[PDB]
């Protein structure tokens, strides 16, 4: 009944720096609005009620204000951990709505990814799988592209990405690479490496390792 | 003190129904109001309704009429959530949360509600340790493959949540049926092999629980 339009949808900003997160409501929800806070797979947690009033345990360094149908919440000189959603939600009306969430990611200095790469484990050549996995840990910008290289130039097929969120600490993001295989596969073939690209040098980062299990 | 226990995971099949629970403890839901909140995959929150325990009322967003049915049981201190003609759309983590007429100011830790007509299986769990001190620090990075589980979820954990620090969880991948998540922790080269460096895997949906040292 009564639609929320938040904005923007996501945003990047820089620590220390000023932020507003926009809400507008279809009609005056005479102030009846409150902003949450979730952090990845956490339930939400609510900063502001009754548009400018700070809930249990936030940093004054949030803020609220609106009135009728206007809405924003402000967060004054940002601090690595406010990478979250958050979400308005109006309750002047049932049924109450909650606007679509604005992702905020912390802009900081390029990082450098550590590559690790381990073989399959024992444990898993028993039952006859080989899985290949590689760590590029702690790096920035999110964006990276790694390939698996399987004796040479010949790159391969059946590998799962996968990206964890922003660090609330460092603000760095990290991923896993796995490629997997049948011992049978494995057992045919020397050398596995995993190849990144990443804009902190001009040259990809060639991780190996010779099978020449005995 | 204070808490709202739920059901945590299940595999319901299309077309069928279910019911979830949420107890109260701490306090008397006859006294407040209770919200049942409902968050698919990578979307946002959608507000479901409300019941009051006192004397029975309830509030719905008409989008979940004749879909949602939400009771509630005063003396068992028990927030009900039915749900009726399941579909795909119907996977989601569903909260229950306590209304103080301000905010929501407890939630439980959510259900896992996956609508699926694959079977349950339970997870693999795989030590990644180094081929020698996996230089690429005077840290030593280690891990866990989980992988081949249904439905979701699973929590990883190190040293029985001691060791939160320098850890990496991957978000899982589903690739037909079955799920893979990761995890990774970093430690000084002083402690280990020296000190005992175990992850703790829990699969709800299977009772599997799983303690893999390294």
């Known amino acids: 009944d009564i639609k929320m339009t938040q904005s923007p949808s996501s945003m990047y900003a820089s620590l220390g720096e000023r932020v507003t997160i926009t809400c507008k409501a279809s009609q005056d929800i005479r102030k009846y609005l409150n902003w949450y806070q979730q952090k990845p797979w956490k339930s939400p947690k609510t900063l502001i009620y009754?548009?400018?009033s700070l809930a249990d345990g936030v940093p004054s360094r949030f803020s609220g204000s609106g009135s009728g149908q206007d809405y924003s919440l402000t967060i004054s000189s940002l601090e690595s951990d406010d990478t979250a959603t958050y979400y308005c939600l109006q309750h002047g009306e049932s049924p109450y709505t909650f606007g679509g969430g604005t992702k905020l990611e912390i802009n900081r200095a390029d990082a450098a990814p550590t590559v690790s790469i381990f073989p399959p484990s024992s444990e898993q050549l028993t039952s006859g799988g080989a899985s290949v996995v590689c760590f590029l840990n702690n790096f920035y910008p999110k964006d990276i592209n790694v390939k698996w290289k399987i004796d040479g130039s010949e790159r391969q097929n059946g590998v799962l990405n996968s990206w964890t969120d922003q660090d609330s600490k460092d603000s760095t993001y990290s991923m896993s690479s796995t490629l997997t295989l049948t011992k049978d596969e494995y057992e045919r073939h020397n050398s596995y490496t995993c190849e990144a690209t990443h804009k902190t040098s001009t040259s990809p980062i060639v991780k190996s390792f010779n099978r020449n299990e005995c | 003190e204070i808490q709202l226990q739920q059901s945590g995971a299940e595999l319901v099949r299309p077309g069928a129904l279910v019911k979830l629970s949420c107890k109260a403890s701490?306090?008397?839901?006859?006294?407040?109001?209770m919200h049942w909140v409902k968050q698919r995959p990578e979307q946002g929150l959608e507000w479901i309704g409300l019941?009051?325990?006192?004397?029975?009322?309830?509030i719905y967003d008409p989008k979940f009429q004749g879909k949602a049915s939400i009771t509630a049981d005063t003396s068992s201190n028990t927030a009900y959530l039915q749900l009726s003609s399941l579909t795909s759309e119907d996977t989601a983590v569903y909260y229950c949360?306590?209304?103080?007429?301000?905010?929501?100011?407890?939630w439980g830790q959510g259900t896992t509600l996956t609508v699926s007509s694959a079977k349950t299986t339970p997870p693999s769990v795989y030590p990644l340790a180094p081929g020698s001190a996996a230089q690429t620090n005077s840290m030593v990075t280690l891990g866990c493959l989980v992988k081949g589980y249904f439905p979701e979820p699973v929590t990883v954990t190190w040293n029985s949540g001691s060791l939160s620090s320098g850890v990496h969880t991957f978000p899982a991948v589903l690739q037909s049926d079955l799920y893979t998540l990761s995890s990774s922790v970093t430690v000084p080269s002083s402690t280990w092999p020296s000190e005992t460096v175990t992850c703790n895997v829990a699969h709800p949906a299977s009772s599997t629980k799983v303690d893999k040292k390294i």
């Open positions: 009754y548009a400018t």
């Open positions: 701490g306090f008397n839901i006859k006294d407040y109001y």
């Open positions: 019941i009051d325990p006192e004397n029975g009322n309830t």
């Open positions: 949360a306590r209304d103080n007429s301000y905010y929501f100011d407890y």
